[model samples]
Target: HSIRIEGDVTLGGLFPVHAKGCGDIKRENGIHRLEAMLYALDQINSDPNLLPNVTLGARILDTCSRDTYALEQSLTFVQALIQKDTKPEKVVGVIGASGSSVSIMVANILRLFQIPQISYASTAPELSDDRRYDFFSRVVPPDSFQAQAMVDIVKALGWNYVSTLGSYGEKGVESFTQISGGLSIAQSVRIPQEDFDRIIKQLLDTAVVIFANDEDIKQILHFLWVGSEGAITIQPKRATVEGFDAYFTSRTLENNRRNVWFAEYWEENFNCKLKCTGQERIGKDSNYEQEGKVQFVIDAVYAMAHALHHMNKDLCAVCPEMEQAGGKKLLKYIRNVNFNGSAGTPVMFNKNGDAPGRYDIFQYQNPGYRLIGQWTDELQLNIEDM
Candidate 1:
């Protein structure tokens, strides 16, 4: 019942180095960080102690999380990967592009083909549906968790009038809608995910405005800082993540850290392990700071692998085209597989294979975010018919 998927993976920000904008700054974003974290993962795979049959090896699919070039390049790679699995288990799982929209694109394709893929850091809340071809699972809780958590923090701070802005994409709209919650939605507008200035102006007057851009949160923050011109200050707010590294530094209001009062999974779990002794808090620190983010992919991979492990690998023996059957058969086996992993609970693939859970809330402190250690905390079935 043990299944092994080839661990060879290639991951990087999807855009090219020279790509114009999406907050690329210097075009040196998380691409290298992807490789570096894989290095850490390589160490984990090589460890003689983690799991008996699990050996980690990844082939780089250099899709810059920011650029379209990287994502387009990845489609070809993903297609080839899909064609190469001569056997059912050979194409066990995928971990790829981290951007919420990009991940959704890839997941959509994977579901169509019935290949299982896991996204570790993609937080777009709307992707967790039970329909489609199935076979996609993510470990990280959806964006609703973080967005709702922030709303709770804002309400705790006694803020009422708020305007919100986000990108017009999978993650942004979904997250904004979740937190907006029938509250005072002043200027809820969506900028084309690529355009910046169009939406920045909308954020000025509201109590809170969330920018949906993955890396642009920092830029928007700086803009907010400058536009405020000492007229107003962020009020112990909970905002979208500042890429991967700033998740830690945003804890303190003294600097950019104060803007990030809390994020999911930063308190109880990460607090003990995160270290910032000799490290900078932005791009330079992302490599070492992946323990929190990568857990999403790990749990997802584990879920997919566990499902296949539980199935009758020989189940396909009855169907001559079993290996070729895109997903109907794969889903038959996957429907029953479930597991427990770094998500701190048992992971069950909803009818569609997405993990069903509430969210984890964590406070920003120390050099990293700490896991607030809260989740829906039940084996609730929300991704399916109630």
Candidate 2:
């Protein structure tokens, strides 16, 4: 199912709404992200200065965490401009297709239409190849940057031998053994979900450099664990939008009746009949926090909004030329979009369609998870914090 918001300009969004164990919507990955785009559209449209007479709208789709299904879903955004009134799903920009595999293929197709995509969570390093994903940009740093940070940690720790684990599609860490001051690899294997479950149960002695999807580790987090991130755990400068918690936490099957997934999520989150939901009330639990990537989602939306704004300003300032704004011209502006992101982070696309890396290192101690260090392109490690 898809959510459509009509406006002068439409930014298409593809999110993983349902996958893994069943048909239930992923509240964090799906609802939180789609709503973030809505929040951003509201933020940009209401700002008198941002888009002036123009309103930004969206067409959000559920990828279902399936590769081909997403590619099939993405085709919805590529209709001819002449078909606008006939069927106006044609989007000048896209916000996601979160999985890198999905992101890459989506970009490959978007490139043909001159449409551009800025993923909030797709971090595969291969997408950084401008020659390949020429129209792809992302708010998140690539997996390579995260790999470098881990290598630095390993080197400093004097761990000559380290093991690596990942699902498919992480060539970023493939370099860990090749260029890391002679770091020795005990073993490196792409974890099969089947074997991963067995490995989880049979764990003995191992310090691992792990990489897996949330689904791959579906069973792992039952026992507390540490994690990574544009999905970084560093709370954004403006962590949640001013009214987002109110907008989101207040939502239910009743008020947000138009949201197709709300009913499913409501039933899934509560229904004492289900396993995970023993008993819950109308409101979300106190421990619930907005998904960390909500900020990234907002930023991706803003990046495109700013791109359209720039396009309008330079090309006759819309009310007319906004229509003449070619998809490629908008993509040019998107590549050059440099502004303060919603998270207060500076947002820009590099020559390779990548943003400079920013990361926080945290530890899951007996008390709670706390940030001990942060990494940037500089790769700073503060021993004192640790």
Candidate 3:
């Protein structure tokens, strides 16, 4: 059930979710996640009927702020801040990172320190599987949520015979495995970041190969034109462009290349109140242009804050039942939990602790990847029957 917020709400997000830290331009690293979070802060802070001191405060930590010069130094800083009780007393929780593949490592560490972690957009399937971590939760639907939908989508489009390519990272590998496991990937190929043309020959028969590399979304496109693999066999499909839009914005389309496509959980209700930086994909032709990539982070930040200050303490308390009944007491509280959010639907921890919702399929028919349709688990039957 959604709770109507009417009193003072003092929430602190771990990123630029707070208005105070987002004001510092140097910290955002020229990314929209931070900038959009700034907008969320202003929106809530400017509300007059709401709590006067109901403003959000941010403990902005640029993920790239640390020198990736050494991974040890990176985790060391995060561990130090999290290990210490540097969090606000009235903090709701926290939301960030695209997936738990990266955020879970930190969330597990946060559990040792007693801070609840709520991710707004993580889709990894493995995070909630173990169930050892008590404080971990997310508002985004998981990969398992989309596997059947993906298989059905391709099958319905008669793309059952398509080829596929995945990068050699955790995300790429997982997404690739999910789709291939459901349907035949036909001629699945691997593209390492260091070597672009390591297996270009394998994509010969693939009509539309989906690229699952976060940074290599463009590199794969460049490989087709510049390298030996000419005539552009691989084009952006669902899950191809993680967040890259340059392939669609630039007039890079030749007669040989295929159109690019991607997916986003577009919200129909809320309007974007932020200044459009225009990633050059959708341009300035529309007000409802492409939103930020990490808008989930903004909502997650608020969710954390909301959960922290207003969570049902009696239900969430470590009762005697937890000692003899394992995590039943904790699990019960989470399963019955429900709250209002903007990332998608009202957030509640399911059996798997994932937020339930629909994912929109967008294609490159127009300027950029535009919303075409959405499929849900309830409707996955249409595909399985096919």
Highest lDDT model number: 2
Residue-level lDDT for 194 in candidate 3: 46
Tens digit of per-residue lDDT, candidate 3, span 1-386: 00012223333233322122223222122234543444455555676532233455543344322222122222332442454544222333344544344466656655654545666555666676635766667767665555445555556555556565521344533554565534565655665444545555456554444545455555555222211122221121122222223322331223212111011111111222223332322333323333343446555555544443233343334223322332233334444556655544555666666666455555443145444566653363231211
Error of 3 at 119 (Å): 2.6
Residues 318-338 of candidate 1: C-alpha lDDT, one tens digit per residue? 233333544455456555666
Q: Could you arrange the candidates by lDDT from highest to lowest?
A: 2, 1, 3
Which parts of model 2 have CA positions greater than 4 angstroms off? Answer: 20-22, 81-89, 155-172, 178-242, 272-287, 362-372, 381-386
Angstrom error of the Cα, residue 204, model 3: value is 6.4
| Model 3, backbone clash pairs (residues 3+ apart or across chains), number | 2
Q: In terms of lDDT, which candidate is stronger, 1 or 2?
A: 2
Query: What is the Å distance of residue 324 in model 1 from its true position?
Result: 5.8
Q: Which regions of candidate 1 deviate over 4 angstroms?
A: 1-58, 66-90, 129-135, 149-291, 312-326, 331-337, 343-353, 356-386
Each model's backbone clash number: 32, 1, 2
Clashing pairs in 3: 92-308, 93-304
- Report the Cα lDDT for residue 134, model 3: 64
Error of 3 at 116 (Å): 1.3
Model 3 TM-score is 0.52
Query: How far off is residue 7 in model 1, in Å?
Result: 7.6
By the TM-score metric, which is better: model 1 or model 2? 2
- What C-alpha RMSD separates each model from the true structure? 12.9, 6.0, 13.0
Model 2, residue 112: C-alpha shift (Å) = 0.9
